[PDB]
Amino acid sequence: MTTNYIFVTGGVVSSLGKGIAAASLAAILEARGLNVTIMKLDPYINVDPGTMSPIQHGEVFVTEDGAETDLDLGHYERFIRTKMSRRNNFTTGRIYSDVLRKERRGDYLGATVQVIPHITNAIKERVLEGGEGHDVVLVEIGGTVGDIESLPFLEAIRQMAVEIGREHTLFMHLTLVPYMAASGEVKTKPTQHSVKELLSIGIQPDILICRSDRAVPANERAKIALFCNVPEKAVISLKDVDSIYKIPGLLKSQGLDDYICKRFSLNCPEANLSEWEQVIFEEANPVSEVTIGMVGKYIELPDAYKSVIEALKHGGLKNRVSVNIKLIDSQDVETRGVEILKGLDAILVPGGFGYRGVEGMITTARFARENNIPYLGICLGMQVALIDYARHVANMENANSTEFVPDCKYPVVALITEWRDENGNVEVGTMRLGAQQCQLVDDSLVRQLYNAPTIVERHRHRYEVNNMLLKQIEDAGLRVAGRSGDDQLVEIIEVPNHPWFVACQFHPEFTSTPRDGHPLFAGFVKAASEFQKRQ
Amino acid sequence: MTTNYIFVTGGVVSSLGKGIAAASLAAILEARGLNVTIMKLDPYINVDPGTMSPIQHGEVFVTEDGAETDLDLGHYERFIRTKMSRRNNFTTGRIYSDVLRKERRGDYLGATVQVIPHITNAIKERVLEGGEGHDVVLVEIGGTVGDIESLPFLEAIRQMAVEIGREHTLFMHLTLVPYMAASGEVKTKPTQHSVKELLSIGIQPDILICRSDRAVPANERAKIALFCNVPEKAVISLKDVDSIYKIPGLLKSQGLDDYICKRFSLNCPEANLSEWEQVIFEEANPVSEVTIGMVGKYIELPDAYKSVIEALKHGGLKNRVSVNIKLIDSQDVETRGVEILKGLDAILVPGGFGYRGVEGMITTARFARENNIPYLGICLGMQVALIDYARHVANMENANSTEFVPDCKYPVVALITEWRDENGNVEVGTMRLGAQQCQLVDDSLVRQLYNAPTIVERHRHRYEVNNMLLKQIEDAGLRVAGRSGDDQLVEIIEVPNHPWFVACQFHPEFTSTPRDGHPLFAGFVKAASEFQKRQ
Amino acid sequence: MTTNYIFVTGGVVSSLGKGIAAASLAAILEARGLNVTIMKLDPYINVDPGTMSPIQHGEVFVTEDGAETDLDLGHYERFIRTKMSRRNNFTTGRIYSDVLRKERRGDYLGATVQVIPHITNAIKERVLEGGEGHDVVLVEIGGTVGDIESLPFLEAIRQMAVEIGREHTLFMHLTLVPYMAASGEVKTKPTQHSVKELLSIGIQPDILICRSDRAVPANERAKIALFCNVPEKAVISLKDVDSIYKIPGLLKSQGLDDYICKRFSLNCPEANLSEWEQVIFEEANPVSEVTIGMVGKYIELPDAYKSVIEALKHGGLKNRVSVNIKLIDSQDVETRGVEILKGLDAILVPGGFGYRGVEGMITTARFARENNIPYLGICLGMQVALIDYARHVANMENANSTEFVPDCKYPVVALITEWRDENGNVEVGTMRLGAQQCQLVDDSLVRQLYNAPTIVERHRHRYEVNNMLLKQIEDAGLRVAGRSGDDQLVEIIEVPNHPWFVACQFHPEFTSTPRDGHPLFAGFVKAASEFQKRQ
Ligand SMILES: Nc1ccn([C@@H]2O[C@H](COP(=O)(O)OP(=O)(O)OP(=O)(O)O)[C@@H](O)C2(F)F)c(=O)n1
Ligand SMILES: Nc1ccn([C@@H]2O[C@H](COP(=O)(O)OP(=O)(O)OP(=O)(O)O)[C@@H](O)C2(F)F)c(=O)n1
Numbered sequence A, B, C: 001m002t003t004n005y006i007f008v009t010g011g012v013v014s015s016l017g018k019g020i021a022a023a024s025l026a027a028i029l030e031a032r033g034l035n036v037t038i039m040k041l042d043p044y045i046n047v048d049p050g051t052m053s054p055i056q057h058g059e060v061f062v063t064e065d066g067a068e069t070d071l072d073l074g075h076y077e078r079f080i081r082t083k084m085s086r087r088n089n090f091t092t093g094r095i096y097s098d099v100l101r102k103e104r105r106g107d108y109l110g111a112t113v114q115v116i117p118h119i120t121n122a123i124k125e126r127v128l129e130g131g132e133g134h135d136v137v138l139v140e141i142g143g144t145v146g147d148i149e150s151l152p153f154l155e156a157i158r159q160m161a162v163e164i165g166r167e168h169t170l171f172m173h174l175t176l177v178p179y180m181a182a183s184g185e186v187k188t189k190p191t192q193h194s195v196k197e198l199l200s201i202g203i204q205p206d207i208l209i210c211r212s213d214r215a216v217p218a219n220e221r222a223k224i225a226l227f228c229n230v231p232e233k234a235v236i237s238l239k240d241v242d243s244i245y246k247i248p249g250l251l252k253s254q255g256l257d258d259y260i261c262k263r264f265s266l267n268c269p270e271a272n273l274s275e276w277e278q279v280i281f282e283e284a285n286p287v288s289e290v291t292i293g294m295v296g297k298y299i300e301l302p303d304a305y306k307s308v309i310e311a312l313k314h315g316g317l318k319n320r321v322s323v324n325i326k327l328i329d330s331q332d333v334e335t336r337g338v339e340i341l342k343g344l345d346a347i348l349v350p351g352g353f354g355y356r357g358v359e360g361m362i363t364t365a366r367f368a369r370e371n372n373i374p375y376l377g378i379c380l381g382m383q384v385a386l387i388d389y390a391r392h393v394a395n396m397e398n399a400n401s402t403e404f405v406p407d408c409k410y411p412v413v414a415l416i417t418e419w420r421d422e423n424g425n426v427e428v429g430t431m432r433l434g435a436q437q438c439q440l441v442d443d444s445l446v447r448q449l450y451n452a453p454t455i456v457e458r459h460r461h462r463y464e465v466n467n468m469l470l471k472q473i474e475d476a477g478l479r480v481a482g483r484s485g486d487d488q489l490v491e492i493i494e495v496p497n498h499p500w501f502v503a504c505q506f507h508p509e510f511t512s513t514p515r516d517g518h519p520l521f522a523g524f525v526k527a528a529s530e531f532q533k534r535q
C-alpha cells in the first residue's frame, strides 16, 4: 500500500505532551496490527543533543544504532515495538549542516540555495527516509505553531501533504484549553487563534487534540469545531491523567483511531488494548510499597532521569510494588552527610558527567554497601561504586576517575588511552554509543536476572574501568559480573557480601518498557521490597 | 491640561477581569488626587443591555442618569467616586445605530459610508465625549484581540493615539500566563502571540498586565519584555487574589501608577490607599459569621445579582461580620416547601421580571415575616412582601401583580395606568430608570439608617404599589416608610412587630461601595448577626 | 558619538531596488560629511555567492579583501567612498555555518542552541562588527517581509532597536504602490497590508519608501500615513527614474536626510549633491553616440554583467559619448557567424567560466583584431584574445585553455600547477581573489591610460596565461602590458598593430564609479568614438 503520514503539531504552548500523545496514538494503531513508526523533528540548531546538558532539555536518549536523540524517542520505544534509529530524530542543525555540506561541494550546480526549495526538500527527504515502508508514520513537529523556529518544518509538511495527496496525509494539532478558576470554565479562544495561525502558514488541521486539566465538554468541542473547519468528531479531549498508559484507551474511546483508519482507507480490526489495560491494572493493584532514593547531580530537572524514573515504575509493575521515588541531590550528601539517606529501601545512582556532586555519590555508594541497602549504579553510578570499593575496601587512598582528578595515584576509572597503574606504568572513538553485546559471568546476580549468557544494552560513556588496577580490587572481593569486546572492558560489577548490589556501565533504563519491564530493575525493586520487610 | 487616555485591551481569553483591573488602576490614580474616569466599549450588537436577560448577560447596571449599562460600570463606581453616565458605556449596536440614522437622514451628503472613517469617527467622538475634562481616561475595549468583533474599536483607538499624540496615550494589554502542572512552569507563549496579534492590527502595547493563578516571576516577565518591545518594569503581574480590593495595592507595589504618571508627565503625590488597606483589613478580620439566603429566579448565574452580592459583602465589612451568601432557587420553595429556608440568619429577595418562581418568593417573604427572620426585599422583593402581607394579614385572597395575574381581584401591584380596586373602580412613560429623590417617613427604620428627610436611589421598574388598595394594607398594620413624586408612589414598606423587615422599590445595591458601605445593607447584616446570636 | 542604524526592509515584492535606495540615501548622508556604511544581509543558504552561477542572481561582486559578495555591494561602492569588505555582506548560510561550528566544539556549554537567542545573537554580532565606528550604518535586509527566509534577520534587528535605543535606530520599509491602468490610480492597499505584516513580526516602520512607476501623490501618501502610524513627511515617493544617479536628489527633495538627521540628533550641513548633479548633466549632454557590442554567454540575464554595463556608461560620461550597449550571445556567433558583429564601434568580451559559447568569443576576438574594431577583454575576454592570437597569428593550431580542452597540445591558458609546453615538458589556493598590485610595462597603451607604473585591480580567476608557451606568442607580436607577483603572471596583453586592443585578467569594472570613471573604460569608449568617426 501507499505509506500514510500524520503530521503532529502543537499550538498555544509547549509542554503539551505531544510526544506522549503521538506515542499513545501509535500504540492504538499498532494494536490494530498496523506497521507504525514515529519521528521527531526538533527546531534546535544542535546537530544532535550529544553536546546538550542533561539539566537543559532533559535526558539524552540513545537508540540501538548509537544515535543521541531527544528523550521523546524513549516514549516512542515504551509505546510501540518498532525500534528507533538515527532516522526517527533530526534537528534544524542537521538539515542546515547537510544542505551547507552539499552547497560548499557544488551539488546545487551554481543555484541560489533557498529555505524553499532546498531546506524544505532536505526535510521532506528525511521524513520519507524514516517513513516509507510503514502503514502509518507519525511526524511530530517540535516548537509551537506561530514561532519562527518551526516554519521550515511546517512549510515542508504542507508541501508533502499536496504531493503525496490528502488521501494519505492528516494534520493533527494539539492545543491548550486552559481552565479559568475565576469563571469556572475551560477556554477555546487559544485553540481558535492557534488554528488561524496554523492556517496562515497554509495548513488546515484535520484533527484537534485539546489538552486540559479536565475533559473538554461537548459544548466547547462543538465551538472549536464550528470556528476551525474541523468535524466535531475530530475534536478530541486529552485531559491530564495520573498515568500516561491510560492515554491510548482515552483516545480510542473517542474514536480517534477509527477516524484515522477511515481517512486512510485502512481495513484493520478494532484495537486490542489488553496489554495497556494490564499495565494499568498492575499499577492500580500493588501489594506493598517501597521508597527508593535516586541520588544524582541533575535532580533540579527530573526529566534528566526520564527513562530511569519510568524503569523504576516498571520494576514496581512486575513485583506489584508501589515505588516512591525520592530525588536526592548528591551535593546535599557532601554538605549534610548520610543523615538524608535514612528511610530508603534502596538507592539508585544514575549516569552523569563532571566532578560536581560525585564525592556525594561515592559516600552514597559507601552507605548502601556498608548498611546492606539494595544499590543499583548506572554508568557514573558504577564508577562511584568502583571508587568506593577501591578506596574503603582495597585501601587505594584517593582512588578516582581521570575525568575528575586527572593526576590521581589510583585512576580506577580512565579513558583506555590513559590507562596506567599506581607507579605510572602503562600497557604495550573512545566514546561507546548504542547496542553492545555483553558477556555475563556464571554465578553472578545479573547472569541469573537476565537468565542468558549474553545481553544487549546501550552505552553512552568514554570513561572505562582501568584493567591495570582492577585485579587489586578483585583480590579485595569485588566481582566482575559482565565484560564486552576485545579489550575485555568491565560492563557490570557486584559486591557479593550484600543482598543486592549491582552497577553497570550501560543504560538499562533505555531497554525497559512498561509492558516487558526489565530484568535488572525488576530484581532491584524486588530487593527493595525484601529490605523494607526485614525492617 | 491635555486629557490622557489609557486604552485597555484583552488577549488570549476573555474573563480576565479587565474591568476590575481598569477600575483598580483608576482607584490608584484617584488616590494620587487625579480626576479620572473609565468607559466600557462593548462589541455586542444590542443597542444597550435594556433587553438582555439576567440569566445570559448578568445584572443590568443603572447609572444616576438612568442609563441601562454593562455590569462593569458597577465595578467602576465601587472603585472610584467619579459618577458613571450613558457616556461611560456604548456598544457596536449604538455606534451602527448612530451612523445608520445620520446616513438615512443625509448627514454624509451622498458619501459612501465606510467602517473607516465613518464607524471609527463615531467611536472616537463617543470616547472624546466621555473622556475630555479628565486628567486620565481608562477606555476598556471589550472582546479579545484576534477576534472580528473588536476590530473597529481597535482601529479607532489606534487612530486616536496618533491624532492626540503618544505623549497623552498609552496601550495597556491584559493577557493570560497559564500554569502547566506537568512542567510546573507558567507560560509566556500566549502573551508573545497575543502582542503580535495586537501589533498586526497596528497597536504596540506600552504596558502588559499578566493575569495568572500565581505571580509571574522575573525571568518570565523579562522574557515577555524581550519579545514584546515592552520595558521589563512595564510588564505587571496581576495574580488571582481572594479579594479584588487587594488589586490597587498589588499594582501600586509594582510601580504601575508611577510608570503612567511619568509617561503622562503628571506630578502628583504618592497614592494614599489607606481606605483600601482598611477594606482589606475589615474583610480578613470578621468577629462573627451569618448565613443570608438570597431567594431569586436567576441564581443559575450569580452575576445576575453582582451588585447585590457585593452590597451584602460591604454590609459585612461595616459590622465586621463574614456573610455566607446561600443562593436559593425560588422555584425550589414552590416544589419542596419552606424547609430549604431553615438555617438562614436573614433572607434577601432581589429584583426580577416574569411570574416564574414568584410564588416561591411570596412564600419566602411569608416565612421571613412569620418566623421573625430579617428580610430585605428589592423591587420584586418588595412586590412579594406587599403581596404576602395583602394575602395573609389584610385577608386579600390571591392578591397579586397585574404583571403575573392581569385580571386578579386585588392588583396590589400594577402599572399607574392599570390602578383599580377589588370592584374594578378606577381614579377620575411607565418605566422608572435612574436617580429619584425619595422622601422618608419620620420614626421609620429607614429614616434612622439614612439620617435624612430625602435620599437619592436608582430605579429600574414599571409595576408600582396600587395606591387604591394601599390604605386597606396600611389598616392591617403595614407601614409606608418612603414615597416619591406627585403620584406619591410607595418606595419603601416596613413590617413593625419584626426585628428588621424592609423592602424598597429602588436598587440600593447600585449605591453600595466597599469604602462607604450602604445604610440599608449595613442595617440588614447587623440584624442578621443579632438574629444569629438569639438562636 | 553612538553609531546610528537604519534597518532597510522590503514589502509586497522583491526587485524594488532596495540596494540602490539604501546606496542613494547613503550618498546624501556622505554629502553631509557623515561617516556612513551599508551592509547586505542575504537570506540565501549559500555561505557566499562564490559557488553561485552568474545566470541565477547576477554578477558575483569582489571586494578589495577578496570577498565574493552580492552585486548590491557594487551599487554601494558606486554611491559612497567607504570601501566594502567581507563584513558588509553575509548570508543565513554564513550565520548557521558559524553557530554550527561553535556548537560542535562546545562554545555553548551544553545549552540548547536556538534561533533565539543563538542565531539572532550571531546576526547582531555581525551587524555591530560591520557598523560600529560609523555615524550611520544602513542595514539592508534581503527577502520580503512576510516570507519565512528573512524572519531571523527581522527578529535580530527588532532586538537591536530595543537594546541600542530608538534614539539611535530607524526602520525604513520599501513597498510597491502599483498603478492599475483600468482604474487610473496607484494602490496603497499592498503598503497597508505589508506594514501590518512587518508589525506582526514586532517592527513599527518609521519611514515608508513607496516604489511606483510614477510619483505617489499627496492623497495616497496621507492615506498610507493614516493606516501605518507613520508621519506624512516620513512617507517618501521613489518613482521609476531613467537614471539611478537622480535618486539621491529625489530623496533629498522630500527631506528624507533631514528627517534621519533630526531623529539621530546629527547636526551636519545641507547635502551638497554637486557631484551627482554633474554625473546627471554629463549623461544628459553627450556630443556623439557609439554602439558597443558586449559578446558573452550570460546575456539572457543582463545583471550577470551589472558592473561592466555601468563601467561602459561611466566610460561614456567621461567622453560625453552616449553608449548604446548591444548584448550579443557568443553562441549566435558560432551559429550565424560574424554577420551579427556588424555595425559595432567596439566589442567587449566579459568574464565567464565553462566552454559553452567560448569559440564564439575567440571568433569575436579574431573579428575585432582583423577588422581593427576597438576590443576590451576581461578575464575570459583576455583568454579568448590570447587563444585567438596563439591560433591565427602564432600558428598554434587548436590552442586552448585546460578549463575547456584539458589535453590540448597548446594550453596557452592553464592552472599554474598544470603549466606544460607543446611536447608535455614542465617547470622545476590557485584562485586569485581581490586587490592585487599589477606592474604596467613602459610604452604600453594601459601604462599611459592608468598614468602610473603600478595599479591595484581585483581578480576572480584560477586559469592563468601559460608562461611556458607565452614567449612564442610574444615572438608572433603579442605585447605583455602588465604582470604581477613572484610567478610574473600575465595581467594585461595588447595587440599593438590595432588602434585599441586591450585585455586584462582582473575585473576593472569593480573599481569604476560614475563620479571617478575608470582609465581603461574611458580609453575604450574614446577609441569607440574615434572608430565611429572614421566610418
Ligand atoms: N473569530 C471570532 C470568533 C468569535 N468572535 C466573538 O467572540 C465573542 C465571544 O467571546 P468569548 O466568550 O471570549 O469567546 P468564545 O468563542 O466563547 O471562547 P471561550 O471558549 O474562550 O470562552 C462573540 O461575541 C463573537 F462575536 F463570536 C469574534 O468576534 N471573532
Ligand atoms: N518568535 C519566536 C519566539 C521564540 N521562538 C523559539 O521558542 C523556543 C522556546 O520555546 P518555548 O520554550 O515553548 O517558549 P518560551 O518563549 O520560553 O515561552 P514559555 O514561557 O511559554 O515557555 C526557542 O527555541 C526559540 F527559538 F526562541 C521562536 O522560534 N520564535
Ligand SMILES: Nc1ccn([C@@H]2O[C@H](COP(=O)(O)OP(=O)(O)OP(=O)(O)O)[C@@H](O)C2(F)F)c(=O)n1
Pocket (backbone or CB within 6 Å): B114, B115, B116, B117, C186, C187, C188, C189, C190, C220, C223, C227
Ligand atoms: N484596515 C482597513 C483599511 C481600510 N478598510 C476599508 O477599505 C475600504 C476602501 O477600500 P479600497 O478603496 O480598496 O482601499 P484604500 O484604502 O483606498 O486603498 P487603495 O489605495 O489601494 O485604493 C474602506 O471602505 C474601508 F472601510 F476603510 C478596512 O476595512 N480595513
Ligand SMILES: Nc1ncnc2c1ncn2[C@@H]1O[C@H](COP(=O)(O)OP(=O)(O)O)[C@@H](O)[C@H]1O
Pocket (backbone or CB within 6 Å): A010, A013, A014, A015, A016, A017, A018, A019, A020, A021, A238, A239, A240, A241, A242, A244, A247, B182, B183
Ligand atoms: N496526559 C498527560 N497528563 C499529564 N502529564 C502529561 C500528559 N502528557 C504528557 N504529560 C507531561 O507533560 C510534560 C510535557 O511534555 P513534552 O514532551 O515536553 O511536551 P511537548 O512535546 O509539547 O514539548 C512531560 O512531563 C509529560 O510527561
Ligand SMILES: Nc1ncnc2c1ncn2[C@@H]1O[C@H](COP(=O)(O)OP(=O)(O)O)[C@@H](O)[C@H]1O
Pocket (backbone or CB within 6 Å): A182, A183, B010, B014, B015, B016, B017, B018, B019, B020, B021, B238, B239, B240, B241, B242, B244, B247
Ligand atoms: N485578580 C483577580 N483574582 C481573582 N478573581 C478575579 C480577579 N480579577 C477578576 N476576577 C474575577 O474574574 C471574573 C472576571 O470576569 P470579567 O470581568 O467578565 O472579565 P473581563 O474583564 O475580561 O471582561 C469575575 O468573576 C471577577 O470577580
Ligand SMILES: Nc1ncnc2c1ncn2[C@@H]1O[C@H](COP(=O)(O)OP(=O)(O)O)[C@@H](O)[C@H]1O
Pocket (backbone or CB within 6 Å): C010, C013, C014, C015, C016, C017, C018, C019, C020, C021, C238, C239, C240, C241, C242, C244, C247
Ligand atoms: N528608481 C529605480 N528606477 C528604475 N529601476 C530601478 C530603480 N531602483 C532600482 N531599479 C532596478 O530595479 C531592479 C531590482 O533591484 P534589486 O536590487 O533586485 O531589488 P531588491 O533589492 O528589492 O531585490 C534592478 O535592475 C535595479 O537596477
Ligand code: NA
Pocket (backbone or CB within 6 Å): none
Ligand atoms: Na465564551
Ligand code: NA
Pocket (backbone or CB within 6 Å): none
Ligand atoms: Na519555555
Ligand code: NA
Pocket (backbone or CB within 6 Å): none
Ligand atoms: Na481606494
